[PDB]
Amino acid sequence: NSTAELEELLMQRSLTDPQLQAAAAAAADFRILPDATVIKIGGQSVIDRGRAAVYPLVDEIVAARKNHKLLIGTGAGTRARHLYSIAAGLGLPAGVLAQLGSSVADQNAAMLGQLLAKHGIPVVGGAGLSAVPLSLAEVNAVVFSGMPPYKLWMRPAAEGVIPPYRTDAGCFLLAEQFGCKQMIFVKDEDGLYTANPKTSKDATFIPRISVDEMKAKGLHDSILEFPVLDLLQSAQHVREVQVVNGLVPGNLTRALAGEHVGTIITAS
Amino acid sequence: NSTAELEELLMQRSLTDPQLQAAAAAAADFRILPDATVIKIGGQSVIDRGRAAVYPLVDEIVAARKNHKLLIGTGAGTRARHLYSIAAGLGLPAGVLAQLGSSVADQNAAMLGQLLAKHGIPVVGGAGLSAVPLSLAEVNAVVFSGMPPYKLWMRPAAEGVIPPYRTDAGCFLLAEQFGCKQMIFVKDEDGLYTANPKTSKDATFIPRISVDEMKAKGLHDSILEFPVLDLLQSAQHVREVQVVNGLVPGNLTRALAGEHVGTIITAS
Amino acid sequence: NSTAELEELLMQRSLTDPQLQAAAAAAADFRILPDATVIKIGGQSVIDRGRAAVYPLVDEIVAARKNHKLLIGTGAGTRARHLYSIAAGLGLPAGVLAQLGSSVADQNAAMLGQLLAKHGIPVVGGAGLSAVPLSLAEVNAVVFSGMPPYKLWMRPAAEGVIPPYRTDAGCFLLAEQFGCKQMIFVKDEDGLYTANPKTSKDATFIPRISVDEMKAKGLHDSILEFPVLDLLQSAQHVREVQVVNGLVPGNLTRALAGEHVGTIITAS
Amino acid sequence: KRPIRLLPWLQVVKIGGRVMDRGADAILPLVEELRKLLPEHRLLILTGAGVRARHVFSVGLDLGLPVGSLAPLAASEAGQNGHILAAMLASEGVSYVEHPTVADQLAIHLSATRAVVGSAFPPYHHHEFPGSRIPPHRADTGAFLLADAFGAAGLTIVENVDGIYTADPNGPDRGQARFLPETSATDLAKSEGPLPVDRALLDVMATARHIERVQVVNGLVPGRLTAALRGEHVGTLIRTGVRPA
Amino acid sequence: KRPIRLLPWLQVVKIGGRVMDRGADAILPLVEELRKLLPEHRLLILTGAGVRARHVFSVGLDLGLPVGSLAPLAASEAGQNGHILAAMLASEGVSYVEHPTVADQLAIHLSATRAVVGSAFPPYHHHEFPGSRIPPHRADTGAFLLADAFGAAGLTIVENVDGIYTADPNGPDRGQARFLPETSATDLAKSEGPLPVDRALLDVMATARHIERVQVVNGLVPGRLTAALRGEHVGTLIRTGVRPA
Amino acid sequence: KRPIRLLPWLQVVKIGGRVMDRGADAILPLVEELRKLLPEHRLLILTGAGVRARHVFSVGLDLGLPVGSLAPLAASEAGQNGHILAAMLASEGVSYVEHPTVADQLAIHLSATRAVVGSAFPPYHHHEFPGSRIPPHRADTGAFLLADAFGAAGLTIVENVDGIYTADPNGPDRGQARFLPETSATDLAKSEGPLPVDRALLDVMATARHIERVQVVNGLVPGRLTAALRGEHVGTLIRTGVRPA
Ligand SMILES: Nc1ncnc2c1ncn2[C@@H]1O[C@H](COP(=O)(O)OP(=O)(O)OP(=O)(O)O)[C@@H](O)[C@H]1O
Ligand SMILES: Nc1ncnc2c1ncn2[C@@H]1O[C@H](COP(=O)(O)OP(=O)(O)OP(=O)(O)O)[C@@H](O)[C@H]1O
Ligand SMILES: Nc1ncnc2c1ncn2[C@@H]1O[C@H](COP(=O)(O)OP(=O)(O)OP(=O)(O)O)[C@@H](O)[C@H]1O
Ligand SMILES: Nc1ncnc2c1ncn2[C@@H]1O[C@H](COP(=O)(O)OP(=O)(O)OP(=O)(O)O)[C@@H](O)[C@H]1O
Ligand SMILES: Nc1ncnc2c1ncn2[C@@H]1O[C@H](COP(=O)(O)OP(=O)(O)OP(=O)(O)O)[C@@H](O)[C@H]1O
Ligand SMILES: Nc1ncnc2c1ncn2[C@@H]1O[C@H](COP(=O)(O)OP(=O)(O)OP(=O)(O)O)[C@@H](O)[C@H]1O
Ligand SMILES: [Mg+2]
Ligand SMILES: [Mg+2]
Ligand SMILES: [Mg+2]
Ligand SMILES: [Mo]
Ligand SMILES: [Mo]
Ligand SMILES: [Mo]
Ligand SMILES: [Mo]
Ligand SMILES: [Mo]
Ligand SMILES: [Mo]
Ligand SMILES: [Mo]
Ligand SMILES: [Mo]
Ligand SMILES: [Mo]
Ligand SMILES: [Mo]
Ligand SMILES: [Mo]
Ligand SMILES: [Mo]
Ligand SMILES: [Mo]
Ligand SMILES: [Mo]
Ligand SMILES: [Mo]
Ligand SMILES: [Mo]
Ligand SMILES: [Mo]
Ligand SMILES: [Mo]
Ligand SMILES: [Mo]
Ligand SMILES: [Mo]
Ligand SMILES: [Mo]
Ligand SMILES: [Mo]
Ligand SMILES: [Mo]
Ligand SMILES: [Mo]
Ligand SMILES: [Mo]
Ligand SMILES: [Mo]
Ligand SMILES: [Mo]
Ligand SMILES: [Mo]
Ligand SMILES: [Mo]
Ligand SMILES: [Mo]
Ligand SMILES: [Mo]
Ligand SMILES: [Mo]
Ligand SMILES: [Mo]
Ligand SMILES: [Mo]
Ligand SMILES: [Mo]
Ligand SMILES: [Mo]
Ligand SMILES: [Mo]
Ligand SMILES: [Mo]
Ligand SMILES: [Mo]
Ligand SMILES: [Mo]
Ligand SMILES: [Mo]
Ligand SMILES: [Mo]
Ligand SMILES: [Mo]
Ligand SMILES: [Mo]
Ligand SMILES: [Mo]
Ligand SMILES: [Mo]
Ligand SMILES: [Mo]
Ligand SMILES: [Mo]
Ligand SMILES: [Mo]
């Protein structure tokens, strides 16, 4: 493999050609924001709960950014579920629902950003390349809306019209795209259990698991969007994620310090 | 009053319902940018005068931001009065005039921002949430265009087609919305007088007055837009404003230091 | 000449009137960003060459911004030449080609900015007034796409449909507009030669030359766009440019230190 | 002396967000009615926010956010309702158009097609008026401001009830709720209780230049919207107190 | 060999900002004339800046601002004139369209409706050419650049005088001002005094590919615009020196 | 149970970027064919990227950039092809429309005019899926996602070859390349070699709701596009495996 061979394949072959694909795989790997951590704040699990959940997270964010560069993406939550149900009932397709759901993640980003503004932390579009705030010790964090850009071009799920790629997927892909060091999902449960702990009383906590192990246990669709787990397996940069309970005070801060709170899900 | 009662009212009642309105009134009060001061630089009274008025204000702004976080909104001035008269003469409604006037405040923001750029002070949209510049000691100020966003949806005055909410109102509402500590209008008179000092020779200076006292004296429409005075009475955060003469060197700086230059107009 | 006379002419005369034009010429001269240096990174000459050319330039940029405020504009290169040839072959006019070429300079800005993001250097629109990054020692540089905004209103050349004002002109006019102290074009040759050094083997290096001397030697259209040389002669602020070889390690850094690497082309 | 009418041939229809909240059961008959109206009128169809805005108010008020924070958050729900309604009418040539397009380019858009849909909320945003913690200038208000600024031929408000009653017909005093076939904005402004239309609506009616009356009709009854657009009395007429020149 | 014509059926009309500055007395008859022209032509109507731009130049030059600062500030005045003119034509289906829309989507917009209005200033902005402290590429120049780039059927310039004279007919030498029924861009470029059209206009005419002539007509005389759009000679014809293929 | 069709009367045509890369010799006959098709169909014409995207991939991969960096850079080449194609059709009322306009306002735009042009790339951008260093969701994929989301009457893919072969008919195994008049997405997905359509296309066909077949036809042969839009079999038919309700 050289640059010459790669460039010949790129000019002369279809992009579908396996030889071109292999040659491209050998390319160098630049990490755009290797020192950053992407964090997702759940919409339903955190922001929808209002002040008791959001205020302590704001304080953790403000403390944490002293030592940790953060990109903080927002979830959507119950308003998006409401839009999805109205639109699904009208027979609208997944691509129209995707657009509706972004508006809700945007609302949540706006509310979070207004709480963080006096601490110098902006809501941005383009979190990965908001180069200035991420470079200043006085800021060192940004907030972003966690929905992917796919809109009407959203790939539908195999069944039904609910967009399969939502804010878990949006935040994860940003972490993956920018070669971030860490991806933390902040939800309302301590992590992954052997069953849904809200429903089942005898669910057992799982500190660490691979995506394959999750699928083999039928946890494919549980605390993270199942499409996220497939993304994680194909990821180049972020080969594991951590799910933590944002309702526990200091849990985010402790996860940022390398404490193994919550569940670690590994690509392999 | 609890969050439960409020949330029940919010789901089950019209927003017009007095019980819901009372419950919402009991909500906590977050100030978004409590350390900032909003300043309006008059269009007709300052920027239209060019260099002799603008250059010293620029120097004050640059000195003042060392110790004071500033949001500096621009007025419109004679070009807007020209647009208003052309458009009014054609029978165009207040909402079309509102749009025309923003362009002029925008021009003024652009000229001011070009003078301030080498000092690190940006012209922004979204002054209240320009979280980064407002958080840096090297910047600590932004410039914004002072017209409200209402455009074609501008509420007309009781008579005539001149937009009643212009740059005084735009800057004030930003201060009020972001819970700023102070609102300073920078004009070309030392403050409020018992009559228009340009016209009347025996007008007496008024150091301090309430909105009610102003109305009772028929100063409802004088140095500030009369709609601003009504806004001030309904304000949650900024319950008084200060009007100062930007033509006096150091007047802005002295007002920022808590010196009682100019006129203080209080909501009550 | 006073402000009064100027203002009378401005109200009462056509803008074409020579008396008004002379009066306007006597106006004060504000430099917006007098401490900044504008640098153009060649598209064909540098960025199209990929990593061997771009990575060392990135390192120089990162080192240089410690001591030098930089606006770094990108060229377009071979993808734009491809668009131009397709579009020219269809008989499309210069104004449609101009639009096509910006997209390519934009791509190049995006690639450069992704390399610089972890060092705190943003890609911006409005480089001249990106007041914040330019004011912070932690940043002190921005990247911009070097095409002028003219689009469909691009003035065509006397012959053919290739836009005569491209990224050399775009970057130069930004330097001129913002009253920058220095304008450096970063290409793939040590500077200007008496003939094209890629083609002619006995070309002689020219360390310093005026625009008139270049025209008299038939170098009007050589290492810089010929329209740039005419712009340089009409410039108010940047009355000379420096062309350096970005392929030579430290050449940009040395040019920023006042070392006379490359060719200095003077307006007169 | 009054301003000219910018689009005198325009008909504006505001669909309540709580009508949209009922989903397909309300929306499909409304859509079929709108479809048949398309050849009869040049329509600007504006959607309100409904229940989602209440949810964002519940979250925002709990976070302590000021009324200017809440206004654009509620507006976004009206916008989403508008996209949903437009999508159902897409096959008839109808699309959602953004506020700048409504404000500056409605003429060309209604030359292209018979109707467009937009959010009824006005862009007051962070410059919303203070006093109440709930944004005062909501969908009825925004729709009226536009209709009147345009000098439209009418504004019809499509509600989930028959019109205005003397009390909330779904509230705790619903036994005393008497239907009002006709009322003036001024009479409404001087009563205290709840209304199915913004209180700010009555304020902007007092300063209106063109629109003499606004009918509030039940969009849950097929035919009423069509009848209202023909000036038939099938809901509550609100007289704005504008008088002819 | 010359580029193709993108919109050969287009007619471009540039209305001077100083015509707009006269207010209703000039604008109402112009609007009535444009209304009657709408069925006859596919029009792009572009407005200039007029007196407000002089005011912003007075402020900006006093602040020491460079010519690239002044160019977009003047352009904004042309844009505002365009919004005013479009609003008067809204009831006929006419709207203001932004520069990106003009540059990329004029075809679809003139399919939707008979005419649109836009700012005649070209987006040179901070990249305006240096040399003069007054922006050289103003409304006549922008209008011509577009008309010629489109390969339009014509560009007509609507002025507040009959056409081009040998001196300013409103100036201190107005007694020697002789009317010019016809002239070439090259002859104009070689004379020194004031013109009612940008000097940069003559430069872009020298490089033009399509437009053979531009008529400058008095918009204060009803009928002249209509006649000019039919190629009747009622003002000053400027020959650009383009020749037929 | 399947979603409704938003624009059932729409025909989508995706023009390959490598067709555009051939310049006037390919583009002028295509343009003349499109011109004659305009009165027959309501068209969304989407352009792919072609060779320029390969160049930006060569630069970007050399810089080490991740697949999400490369996706919008390639997309820009499709967008530029779209502007070029639209410009040639401008005189027929056709323009380039941006992705937000396609996504939310196609109905009104196809009411205004007979066809519009847009970039076939979908806005996956920095959220492109990881796994390959080459962006997987390219122009064929984007075009299909739209056509199917709209429930369009068809999607036709215009290629620089006759259709799909069992091997690259321009590659080193071109002697064994056998033409495939008809195939299913599933059969294609289970073969290993190169295709003239994105592999992600086959994936989105597996989840499609409306479009039963997609024809790939040679845009270098005049008449084939026209025939394909009439459902005549003149290229390779790909069955998506959607079945009628
Ligand atoms: N096996 C499991 N372990 C833990 N949690 C589970 C499991 N199965 C289901 N869950 C549920 O999944 C929920 C997390 O999904 P949820 O949508 O609330 O997260 P979110 O990030 O808030 O989404 P959004 O941000 O879009 O609202 C948990 O609250 C939990 O009730
Ligand atoms: N009683 C009064 N006391 C003081 N000033 C008064 C009084 N009555 C009228 N004025 C006049 O009001 C003027 C302030 O209004 P003006 O519109 O100039 O302010 P502005 O902020 O420049 O407005 P804009 O910014 O939109 O141009 C003063 O210059 C003064 O002449
Ligand atoms: N007399 C000369 N001296 C030096 N270089 C010359 C001369 N004449 C022609 N050239 C050529 O001009 C080239 C510079 O133009 P080029 O377009 O490559 O620059 P660029 O900034 O990369 O343009 P873009 O950025 O748009 O791709 C040099 O590579 C050199 O080959
Ligand atoms: N005096 C009244 N007459 C009629 N309805 C009333 C009255 N007071 C309260 N209401 C209530 O208002 C409800 C309509 O609610 P609302 O006006 O909030 O919905 P909407 O107009 O669909 O919402 P949006 O303003 O977001 O478009 C009615 O169903 C009724 O219960
Ligand atoms: N040689 C000339 N012939 C005719 N008019 C002239 C000449 N020289 C100067 N003028 C003046 O130019 C005036 C027209 O001014 P100008 O061209 O600035 O306005 P405009 O075209 O309406 O403005 P804009 O360029 O902003 O659209 C005429 O009224 C006349 O006084
Ligand atoms: N199995 C196959 N059948 C037919 N063509 C193939 C096959 N495999 C590879 N190809 C090649 O794919 C080429 C078409 O290339 P490609 O699909 O990249 O262009 P395009 O569709 O115009 O590009 P874009 O996706 O940017 O619009 C054909 O000319 C052919 O050489
Ligand atoms: Mg209501
Ligand atoms: Mg003129
Ligand atoms: Mg292909
Ligand atoms: Mo969005
Ligand atoms: Mo957005
Ligand atoms: Mo926001
Ligand atoms: Mo916002
Ligand atoms: Mo931003
Ligand atoms: Mo921004
Ligand atoms: Mo955005
Ligand atoms: Mo966005
Ligand atoms: Mo956006
Ligand atoms: Mo970005
Ligand atoms: Mo961006
Ligand atoms: Mo960016
Ligand atoms: Mo930034
Ligand atoms: Mo930012
Ligand atoms: Mo920034
Ligand atoms: Mo604006
Ligand atoms: Mo703006
Ligand atoms: Mo600006
Ligand atoms: Mo600007
Ligand atoms: Mo900004
Ligand atoms: Mo910005
Ligand atoms: Mo803006
Ligand atoms: Mo704006
Ligand atoms: Mo904006
Ligand atoms: Mo904002
Ligand atoms: Mo914003
Ligand atoms: Mo914001
Ligand atoms: Mo920012
Ligand atoms: Mo900013
Ligand atoms: Mo652009
Ligand atoms: Mo752009
Ligand atoms: Mo970017
Ligand atoms: Mo970007
Ligand atoms: Mo920016
Ligand atoms: Mo930005
Ligand atoms: Mo941009
Ligand atoms: Mo741009
Ligand atoms: Mo832009
Ligand atoms: Mo700017
Ligand atoms: Mo800007
Ligand atoms: Mo700016
Ligand atoms: Mo900024
Ligand atoms: Mo920035
Ligand atoms: Mo828009
Ligand atoms: Mo837009
Ligand atoms: Mo705007
Ligand atoms: Mo727009
Ligand atoms: Mo636009
Ligand atoms: Mo736009």
Ligand SMILES: [Mo]
């Ligand atoms: Mo743009």
Ligand SMILES: [Mo]
């Ligand atoms: Mo646009």
Ligand SMILES: [Mo]
């Ligand atoms: Mo637009």
Ligand SMILES: [Mo]
């Ligand atoms: Mo757009």
Ligand SMILES: [Mo]
């Ligand atoms: Mo736009």
Ligand SMILES: [Mo]
């Ligand atoms: Mo968007």
Ligand SMILES: [Mo]
């Ligand atoms: Mo838009």
